[PDB]
Every structure is written in C-alpha cells, then in structure tokens.
C-alpha cells in the first residue's frame, strides 16, 4: 500500500502538528479525548477508556 496518511516517511514520526499514527485511541492522526470509551467489559463496570495522551486502549487499572 501507500505511506500512512499520518506518517512523515522522512522522519518516521507523525506529520508535524499531529499526535499519532494508528490505534483504537487515535483518529485522524490525533488522540481521542481522555475518557472516550475504547472497550466495554463483559461482566462488570470496569470498561477501558482512552487516556488522551497515548493511542492504545489501556487496561483499566482497577482491572
């Protein structure tokens, strides 16, 4: 395929002014707002939330 639209292939980092490349908590090259729900849990009330500072979906620290 092509170079990722968020990627600057000269640096291998996000294009200047953007936050991120891909991931459940990245959209349009920016971090989704902290508290955005990224995975709802099965059994309980412990869901996983975007951090606002990273592009992954962090495991809720309570479990």
């Amino acid at each position: 395929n092509s170079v990722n639209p968020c990627c600057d292939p000269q640096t291998c980092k996000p294009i200047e002014g953007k936050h991120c490349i891909s991931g459940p908590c990245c959209e349009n090259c920016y971090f989704l707002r902290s508290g955005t729900i990224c995975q709802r849990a099965r059994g309980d009330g412990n869901n996983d939330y975007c951090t606002g500072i990273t592009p992954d979906c962090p495991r809720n620290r309570y479990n």
Binding site: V3, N4, C7, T11, C12, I21
Partner: protein
C-alpha cells in the same frame, strides 16, 4: 524521500531494526550502553547512551 530505517506503512523502524536517527542510533540500531554521546565542558560528568533509546540523556549526577 523515505529514510532507509523507516517502514512508512507502519511509521516504525523496519523489521529487525531498533531506531531511525538520533545521537545514540547508527545504521538503524541503538549504540551500546555506555558509549559516550557528549563530552562535558568542565570536568568529567559526560552523557552516555542507554543501549535502549536513541536520545543522549543528561548525566544524572548533573
């Protein structure tokens, strides 16, 4: 261009490589832990490569 270390579909270092550029990166790999990356002006507190990142960190004794 694209830098020879970059996978531009992922925007990460290519398979088998460590890093892209930086004082503690050479040919897409980290320089060994303890390699001097900047010699101090006064006295002997130099800055050293970590072995696991491409930056040159400030000496912690200051």
């Amino acid at each position: 261009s694209v830098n020879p270390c970059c996978d531009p579909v992922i925007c990460k270092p290519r398979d088998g490589e460590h890093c892209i550029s930086g004082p503690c990166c050479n040919n897409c790999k980290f320089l060994n832990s303890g390699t001097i990356c900047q010699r101090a002006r006064g006295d002997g507190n130099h800055d050293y490569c970590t072995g696991i990142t491409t930056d040159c960190p400030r000496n912690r004794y200051n």
